[PDB]
Design a protein around this ligand. Structure first.
Ligand SMILES: Nc1ncnc2c1ncn2[C@@H]1O[C@H](COP(=O)(O)OP(=O)(O)OP(=O)(O)O)[C@@H](O)[C@H]1O
Ligand SMILES: Nc1ncnc2c1ncn2[C@@H]1O[C@H](COP(=O)(O)OP(=O)(O)OP(=O)(O)O)[C@@H](O)[C@H]1O
Ligand SMILES: [Mg+2]
Ligand SMILES: [Mg+2]
Lengths: 241, 241
């Protein structure tokens, strides 16, 4: 349902090759984890899904549609991206979550906040969902902001959801709620998670290991650990050393 | 050399109490980990060490100097903070690292970059340290940007170095490099590390567990892990399973 075929990418005609002959099929309903060293090409890979950039070689396809000849506006709607950092607008928490669709009532707002694990702390603020967030973003803490951003992205409701280190600063309990809810979140859609914390993607249907712009290893968490000399094993065994 | 006595803090006279009756002493040269749930008061604690805000009861002292009497110019040179997200200026890597002390010898810049684990990727670039970074912050990757920021802070050379989730989006190898270099990073200084990944603060001299604006637990990695009912043990058990 999402296909990378013979993808070769570099940023400038002078730039070194960033993505080197990548081939990948991601079928609808799959949770895909993407791991690898800092600078290996994880983010660049997700940018071709959005067509901020075009490859010099190969094709990107969604549902059999070549993105190179697809409608620009159509593609924008299909992809929702949650980054590491998120600025919230100087308005209420409910308004911030409902950005993509007001008129959508309090219940689907709360459900989105319950999925993101935000409803608890919002209920215990005095002003509640009517709490006006900062003129810069953070009248709240980093993780609270980030959970509001996740709740908003769920309301946005794209058919392709990209988490780019979205949870890596959240505490284990907070991330667990979101990863526990991943079964409801990815119903009828594709979820792509780029993680530095390997434990985040432990239950992905497929984990992709990037190195120097190549998909170097692949499989489930336990399948990747079967080879002790694998790159995935080396990073995993660095958890506490 | 860092003391909190009977600290009560809130952000506004309207705001609820964030930090309550906190007492903390951190001697010179130590490496301190701070852990806790999102919204527990970790960032707030470090904000008072810079006097962005002032308490209603209690005192903050650095090297025996009450911050109510401190020179604001002095304190900024004393406390250097690396956050989760960092902006680079649209100029060369060496100009970005050198910002605080330009004209400083090139091998001191390179040394700081080696401690951050940035030297290897910078050298592999076509233009090396002379590479003009993002027309935004980064024509680099997030983790590359982050390691440049860490190097920049080491060059600032503060007596107190605060990492607020600075490594949480770094891969296990890049973070391991920084933590192995920690024994050189904290030569003649104190280092405070806020992390969601509890493995990051494993070898810290002391670990501080925050919960709802209070220091609930305090000790060494395994001393805290030994407690059958402690929050630290509960949070660690959420990592492995
Ligand atoms: N705008 C850009 N122009 C030129 N090169 C870039 C640009 N953005 C990234 N790169 C380069 O492409 C390579 C991969 O970058 P990418 O952001 O995809 O890596 P990443 O795996 O997401 O890194 P991290 O894990 O640190 O976020 C790196 O060598 C990086 O320097
Ligand atoms: N600028 C601010 N104004 C008012 N309240 C704030 C501000 N920053 C944080 N708070 C509130 O103070 C409490 C503690 O915030 P703090 O940022 O210290 O938590 P934290 O432990 O750093 O969380 P995280 O791990 O998510 O960053 C939270 O309940 C938050 O809503
Ligand atoms: Mg990236
Ligand atoms: Mg914080």
């Amino acid at each position: 349902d999402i296909t990378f075929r013979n993808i070769r990418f570099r940023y400038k005609p002078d730039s070194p090759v960033i993505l080197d002959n990548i081939n990948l099929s991601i079928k609808q309903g799959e949770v895909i984890g993407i791991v690898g060293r800092s600078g290996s090409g994880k983010s660049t890979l997700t940018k071709l899904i959005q067509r901020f950039y075009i490859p010099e070689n190969g094709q990107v396809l969604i549902d059999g549609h070549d993105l190179a000849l697809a409608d620009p506006n159509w593609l924008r709607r299909q992809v929702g991206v949650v980054l590491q950092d998120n600025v919230l607008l100087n308005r209420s928490i409910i308004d911030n979550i409902s950005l993509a669709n007001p008129g959508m009532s309090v219940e689907k707002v709360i459900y989105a906040a319950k999925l993101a694990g935000a409803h608890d702390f919002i209920s215990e603020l005095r002003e509640g969902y009517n709490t006006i967030v900062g003129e810069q973003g953070a009248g709240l803490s980093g993780g609270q902001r980030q959970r509001i951003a996740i709740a908003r992205a769920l309301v946005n409701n794209p058919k392709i959801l990209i988490f780019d280190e979205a949870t890596s600063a959240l505490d284990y309990e907070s991330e667990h709620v979101i990863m526990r809810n991943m079964h409801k979140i990815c119903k009828g859609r594709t979820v792509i998670i780029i993680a530095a914390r390997l434990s985040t993607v432990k239950n992905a249907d497929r984990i992709i290991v990037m190195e120097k712009g190549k998909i170097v290893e692949q499989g489930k968490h336990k399948e990747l650990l079967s080879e002790p000399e694998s790159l995935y094993s080396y990073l995993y065994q660095l958890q506490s050393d």
